[PDB]
């Protein structure tokens, strides 16, 4: 009984890529843990 989020892969790709910086790695990790984790892809883009 469990559900495998796709935050892990976000936060790895720019846990082991150079490219990514450090706060580019937060960044990235807040936008699969928000919309994937945090929220529902319902609606295409946030509204603000």
Known sequence: GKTDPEL???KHQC???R???EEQKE???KGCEK???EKKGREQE???
Request: glycine share 0%; aromatic share 16%; charged share 35%.
């Open 15 to 17: 846990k082991v890529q």
């Open 46 to 48: 946030e509204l603000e």
């Open 35 to 37: 919309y994937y984790k």
């Open 8 to 10: 892990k892969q976000c």
């Open 19 to 21: 490219q990514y910086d």
């Open 27 to 29: 960044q990235c990790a």
